[PDB]
């Protein structure tokens, strides 16, 4: 997350900080961002979990904000299900089908309860995206506190230009960047949300997946196009 502002208790209340556990009583290590799409389900990127795909290795935190008081009973979650897309592959530079689902629950077995600091984010209609040039917002702890920024959707035609990414971009992906190339997602934003408006409703359009550099000119951030994974998602969710 290069540039932008720090969020507050009502900014990006769907954001999930995904940590990896360390041996013994050592504090956990931040691993990835994620989005609460259902009270029991967080959507993230598969490449965040491919090394250690067993659910016991992770813990999810919600409701992060400088004005929100940490309550472990309602904001800390164990992972009772870790689902990576079965056709996740690592290419030369791009990830393919880079999406994962985490089913969460508190120590008393409850799911996420909506509050000032914890809300779900709506999924897009099938194959529906905001028009190119739209303002979407990204969020993360990537390259101390939660930040958010604004990027613009970039058309595939523009993105698939040789001096961009060429044929390493397919239509199950979404490109987004700052026209001034000053703001963008970076290392550590992986799995985090790309929020676009669709019918004036905030929508999880993208999942941070990859990119050559950060806010590098002619190279925008690449995202998993969520509108093309609804059938997959709801096949595990409901």
């Amino acid at each position, epitope marked *: 997350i290069v540039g932008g502002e720090f969020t507050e208790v009502e900014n990006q209340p769907w954001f999930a900080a995904i940590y990896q556990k360390n041996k013994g009583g050592s504090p956990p290590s931040f691993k990835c961002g994620g989005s609460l799409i259902s009270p029991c389900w967080v959507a993230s990127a598969a490449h965040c979990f491919i090394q250690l795909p067993k659910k016991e290795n992770y813990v999810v935190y919600l409701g992060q904000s*400088k004005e929100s008081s940490y309550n472990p009973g309602e*904001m800390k979650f164990e992972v009772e299900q870790l689902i990576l897309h079965e056709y996740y592959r690592e290419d030369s530079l791009a990830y393919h089908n880079d999406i994962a689902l985490l089913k969460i629950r508190t120590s008393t077995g409850q799911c996420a309860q909506p509050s000032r600091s914890i809300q779900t984010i709506a999924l897009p209609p099938r194959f529906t995206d905001a028009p190119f040039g739209s303002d979407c917002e990204i969020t993360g702890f990537g390259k101390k*506190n939660l930040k958010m920024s604004v990027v613009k959707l970039v058309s595939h035609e523009q993105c698939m230009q040789p001096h961009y990414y060429g044929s390493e971009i397919n239509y199950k992906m979404l490109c987004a960047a700052d026209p001034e190339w000053k703001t963008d997602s970076c290392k550590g934003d992986s799995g985090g949300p790309l929020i676009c408006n669709i019918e004036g409703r905030p929508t999880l359009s993208g999942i941070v997946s990859w990119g050559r550099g950060c806010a590098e000119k002619n190279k925008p951030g690449v995202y998993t196009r969520v509108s093309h994974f609804l059938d997959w998602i709801q096949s595990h969710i409901g």
Partner: nanobody
Amino acid sequence: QVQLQESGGGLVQPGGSLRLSCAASGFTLGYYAIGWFRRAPGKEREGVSCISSSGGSTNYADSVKGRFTISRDNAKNTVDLQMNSLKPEDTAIYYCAAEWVPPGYGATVQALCNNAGYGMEYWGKGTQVTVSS
């Protein structure tokens, strides 16, 4: 091999004082917020007093404000609870609990202490404090 261990439990006269200590073995307690919770006969677990990892932030239940004092030594790997002006109402099993507070939240440990300690990572076996004539 992580262990939390309370000590200092005993029998004291009403109005007397008593000091509890929580010690950790197998890990560094200083990274953790610590809470003292208690269960009296019949009632449910309640937060008595809590303190952040660095010790900068504390919280007390109204019942014990001005009577109890929580403190810690991150060099010696301990957290203490000083109890003055003890009342019969204070009779209970006192537990020590530790929880790592992720970055990105408020500095307060109030919500950590007001919620009966559900979700707290580590727990001691507890020590008995009895106030009686």
